[PDB]
């Protein structure tokens, strides 16, 4: 009765983080920020390919590139919001961004170059977030669900890029 | 540089990465069986929607149509995943019922119609529960598709049972 | 009195939309409506199959048309079933024997040219079938005639849309 | 062949939509449009009466249909009045003698079966009435024919909807 | 009996909407579609001119009708060009000789009554032209017939709207 | 306690009509149906005028006529709904409709005729509904508010028609 | 002459909407608003319960009305709480003693006829309560009177809607 | 035919019928004084809206703008009625403040701005309460306008007082 | 093999969404669903009280969060009640004993800091309460688990939003 | 370091509270503010005049003018808002005081008796604003693009209002 | 000061054209009508290309053709509106339309033909409108802004067509 | 005549850039890319401040921080679109982003810190883009108008940030 309340009153400023939070909060925060860097890098890369993919066939890829780009930023916003709830700071610094990220920014010369670099990044993110989802287990459903939702989106991005690549050269 | 090499190996496989620990072949078979089930349930509900005329029946007819269209959304969801996992979705009407866990049943009465839909929903619920168990933690993206469909079928079952209890 | 218009309407009142003035062969029009319904359901399934399988840069353009066509087909299916019910029939959504009732076929195709060609064939079959139905109806059933005349126009668009693609292929 | 198309159009220019090529009997087409208009106004009033009076769980389903029908009837009224004006007539909205001009009646009914049955009778009267008008017009006035053909298709739907209800009652 | 339906469809398959059953004179139907297209383009330009020139209190009322008509005329143009393409023709948007191909003329007018009358004349020319076309088509080409029936009905509205204004002048 | 509920269960099928309803229900119902007849008549008269008022200036009146007609029907619906709540039957019968109504259906020959006839009807309704509002007093707020809302609308309809009539012949 | 209108406005300025001219008994009006607020909150909970429990074909129609009423009750609750704040009070949303404060009861009902009857009883209690409040206010507080007059008209509708259902039942 | 004769006499008076029992001339005077008040209050609120910058103040600034546009809606309501009753609405900025029950006051601080708006609302509340009493049952349509405006001013007064209590 | 899947579904058919394969303790899941329902109804009432009472410049920002939270609480209430029905229970909206059933309390608060603190305490009680329920369900009831996982995530947001405010206060 | 780019930033830190007004602002801030406020007064007067004409223009033909009057009135207020917004960005105070509003405004409030009066009075005001704002645009030159663009956008609207009113007046 | 108004009263019927209008109005009107013809011609050419560009790749260009066509008409409307404000008459006559225009109507046979002809026309318009913008200088801000808004639109159209042509 | 067409055909692949383009294309591209980097940096800084500014008062600034962030990205898109039209490549590389930009990414500790850094950045951009507008003169209206439109937005951002700082400093 009053013990339910006393548990909640202890360390109240910790907010979303309760007596029941069983995950390794600092390590989760580290992973959230690595993912955030990946999303920002993927956002900048896709935006680049979008502007550069001109032409008839390429304009189709350009549309997918832009759609992907803005989804990446949605993933970034989702992750930063969680970083804040779990007592961290989201790192939007462009300095060293690529070093924190699992993906690279690669301009590419051809369209096949562009698509391949995006496909490579998605497959890196897929396996990375699969590992994080496994690592979280049942200790942090709310964070686990963020990565599960991002994962499902990345799997779509991978298929969308691979579908294009098969038609190229 | 090995993360990049892991990703470059079998790049044409797309969403299916080295870390995909499920039996891709078996998941594809289950996805197509679900797809057939959803198309069959769509056709049955669409039949019942048109045939359920009257004062009281027209209320059931509305639910029939809502379910039919939800079934088609499930079909699209499953087919999309079949493609991401490197399969082919089988929309062939020939042998459609043999592939499906459900049946197409016209019914003579409205109680017939509701009962046949209720039976189909309960077949799907237990079938998809088993698939979700089979997937476990190997394919979250597919597991989440079936979990979302499952929740809908549970709604469809309650809606049909709620009606059936009021009938003759 | 003018009580004769009312007496006409009261006779066989449960027949609903079908009045004394309905001059068509109701049983046959219902047969044609159900054959048309089967054709649309098949065409819907074929187009959806092609939509999911047509991946790539060029093909994704075709896939969009395939999906647009698919849903137009189901709209036709709904129009026809609605009319079947108004004329006192039962619409047959049974997938068993669906192809046997249909003027069209379900064909997966291997290439994109295969998919486009098969859809073009189905449309040209439907166009000529529905022209024949429209003629059979004559002035006996304006409401049913108008459904097929409207579907016909959609099919001519689908045929032109698929042919326009096929000319650019291989 | 240019100045003769123009001279054709300049003659009786005040006739508006009604050109030399208008092969129908304008005076009679106007009579039929105004009878149709009275029928639609009457059917609107009857349905509105039934809408307000049909209370209860089961009745409210019919009442919803009564209202949809009522408002479709007024749409038909506007469509017909609009055409009357294009053909140089005057639409008669006068409530005095409205029923005598109409093919339908205003009938309150006591029961829901009464109300549904009376609406079903009126829809079936309109169907055959408008079928005859469509035949009378033939190819002489496509624009007026298409109005009646569009109204007819709606009346057939209204008849089916009322009959579908009556089967659950009688 | 199913392979012969398929054989009919394969013969001349590139002709698209035009099937073995198409019983109209395709070449002549196309000529009529192109004459109608010119009529609509001419009527569009004339109405647009009258719209801009019809200033004042009362005239602004006619000007609104002029603009609504102009844009309906272009919709008619679009319908006809779409049909020209389905039947294997070419829609002629060439401004050179546009008036010669058209049943109508471009006429500036000095007064508002000038403008309204010229528009009324054009609508009455189109009405009788399209009635003749609809008759020529008969039951041979429902899809084209329905286009002209739909355009005709709009032209009758335009004719009545212009005549209703002219009666006040 | 048990009397608040006992007052409400007694005569429960009388619905909105409670023990506290202090108005002369039968008379309120009579007035509601007379008002309903008036609105139906005014609806038909305005619709007649709307279709017949063609021309440059007349089309401006035609638009006001249509707005008025459709407001009249809203009033008809408002009143019929209230008749049902108070235990009556709304009379939509076209036979003898004018005999029940305070206003008349008048085709009019000229536009000034049409405007004048509408203005006369609005001023009849205004004075009728003011008397009903006074008659109701505080005995039936819900019904009173219906008439106060209709009255305000009729005052607008009257001002709109008089504004037109001042500019005429 | 402008300095006295301003001086009246400066006297007790923090009282806000409540001016020197407010002629009602602020304390008592606040009591009635809070009693009404409890009534609406209880009615919201009752209707919500009935909405979820009324399953079946015919019953689902009542469930739709139950939900609509439920949410209209909460709009009334908000309207009343908004006014309580303007008159310098505190709106009591405490679930403890909510029924003791409310003019209506929460009653689960066993049957649909039960549910409808209990809702119908509550509406008729509210009607007579709010009519009495409207009389008590007189011309002293138009802004509050208008809240109750608007709620009253809504309750008369809810009462009629429930009674219309009850007549068709058992 | 007597109802018709009543309506035909003085037909150009429009909404004002034989049964209009209010003092039309005096009602027009009050509508125009109220109109002036609303225009003045609109300008003052707009002034405060632009001048209330900062973290806290921007919250008040949003309220200032909302109030401002509501004031103009009232001006529109009042002018519409002035026309229906056969008058002329006075939008002249010369002497606008003399006709208005409220003042235009710039204020130096935010507390100044809030206090001045609160003073104006309480002036209008009591002014319109008096007008509603004067009308009684003689002019329902006009009475309802003032009753609707009055309720809005009470909200504005409560909203401003709610801000003032938190300030200084 | 088709008649055995079908026989499974006919056994206990009236149970609806609850199939032979449902491996949870339906009785207990329903108990927890109803305790959650009470918690959300109480949290809704508390937040609504705070919304209306939190006046002022800074406080109005909190008031907005209070209202957004309140309506999210009611959405949770509806989700939970819907599930109670599917599992064959009855959702308890009775205000009598509502607080005894709820894991949270209704607390008026005197200051804004009071209000924020009480809301924050409530969210943290809910967070840990629903985490325990998610554990209890395991893999036995995905559909119910997902409801709680979705609610949990919202409560974590509500906790962060209230704590973010409290850090700036007094 | 190497006070390079560090110079762009040191320019920005100086007088930071001056906000939009930077070291690069080459216009006479004091004078631009006077002009913005005169324009603001002009628009408020034009709004009140047009609103007056809207309510008084009853009749068949007049109601068409009444519609134009109302569209114009609300555009005038949009202009007033645009100008007041700029006054704040440049560190001024926008004067909404109705006392002396006309003395500050380039236009007049004129009731007019007839519709022809109303149309003419609005037409005169537009032509005053057109030439006033042309002069202001010229005075600004290239010193304040953001303020110039406000006046250029208002100017184009006033030219439309002028043409709209003249088109009506020709028929009277 | 009473002179501000007398300036505005002189030649009042000229409307937007005031004493301060320093441009050569007759010449501005000539340029506006030449631009109008250019837009009308470009509109017809684009529509022709839209209907004729069938196929997979071509349908992409066809969509751009239609967007451009309708933008061309928006420009035509902008220019005609300005002709009226400045006291001219807009010439929509199809006879001699091409002679008045800086562009041509060219059907083209291939898609490369169509795209090239559009690109050529856009570059003609760009340099024409740059010259007009220069001729206007500061004498007519309102007309100058119309051409600058169109110019930027034409630069987009040129880039869009060149982007397509590079792939052929 | 035939020379307008020949002028347009020369260097046709240059697209928007015609013979009449009198600006230094190479330099305009350099300036556009410096602005592009500035906007990307300002976007990241504002997003960081948005997530970190929690509390009652701080949430007001956070809302503005977010509105600014998204306006900055709109500016980035405008600038990149023009870079492509003038035949350049837009540089979205996070590597060296700050070195190319007139602005910096600065986390700040306090809200006063965040607001001040945003205010400084806007004032740098304001004066930088004013200079670019002068450099363009009348040689490139389309680009000048882009910067003139961005400038007006930056002036708003500066006023909005300064309005906040006055309440803090
Ligand atoms: Fe991705
Ligand atoms: Fe289902
Ligand atoms: Fe098709
Ligand atoms: Fe009808
Ligand atoms: Fe009907
Ligand atoms: Fe046409
Ligand atoms: Fe036309
Ligand atoms: Fe009226
Ligand atoms: Fe209620
Ligand atoms: Fe106020
Ligand atoms: Fe909750
Ligand atoms: Fe919560
Ligand atoms: Fe203006
Ligand atoms: Fe162009
Ligand atoms: Fe920027
Ligand atoms: Fe900025």
Numbering used by the authors:
A (entry chain J), F (entry chain H), L (entry chain G): 9 to 177
B (entry chain L), H (entry chain C): 10 to 177
C (entry chain I), D (entry chain E), G (entry chain D), I (entry chain K): 8 to 177
E (entry chain F): 8 to 176
J (entry chain B): 5 to 176
K (entry chain A): 9 to 176
List sentences from the manuscript.
We report the biochemical, structural, and functional characterization of the protein coded by gene PA4880 in the P. aeruginosa PAO1 genome. Our structural work shows that the product of gene PA4880 is a protein that adopts the Dps subunit fold, which oligomerizes into a 12-mer quaternary structure. Unlike Dps, however, the ferroxidase di-iron centers and iron coordinating ligands are buried within each subunit, in a manner identical to that observed in the ferroxidase center of P. aeruginosa bacterioferritin. The ferroxidase centers in Pa DpsL catalyze the oxidation of Fe2+ utilizing O2 or H2O2 as oxidant, and the resultant Fe3+ is compartmentalized in the interior cavity.
Protein purification in the presence of MgSO4 enabled isolation of dodecameric DpsL in high yield. The protein was used to screen crystallization conditions leading to the formation of prismatic crystals from the Salt Rx HT screen condition F9 (800 mM lithium sulfate, 100 mM Tris pH 8.5). X-ray diffraction from these crystals, followed by structure solution and refinement produced the model termed Pa DpsL-dd (2.9 Å resolution), which contains 12 molecules (a dodecamer) in the asymmetric unit, 33 sulfate ions and 24 Fe ions. The sulfate ions are in the 3-fold pores and near sites containing R13, R33, and R103. Each of the subunits exhibit a Dps fold identical to that depicted in Figure 2A, except that the position of N-terminal residues D8–S30 is made evident in the 12-mer structure by well-defined electron density. Consequently, the structure of the dodecamer corroborated that each of the subunits in Pa DpsL exhibit a characteristic Dps fold that harbors a ferroxidase center typical of bacterioferritin. Sulfate site 1 is located next to each N-terminal extension, where the electrostatic interactions between SO4 2- and the side chains of Arg13 and Arg17 stabilize the two-turn helix observed in the N-terminal extension. As is typical of the Dps quaternary structure, each of the two three-fold pores along a three-fold axis has a different microenvironment, thus resulting in two types of three-fold pores, termed here A and B. Each of the type-A three-fold pores, which are formed by residues near the turn separating α1 and α2 contain a SO4 2- (site 3), which interacts electrostatically with the three Lys65 residues at the pore.
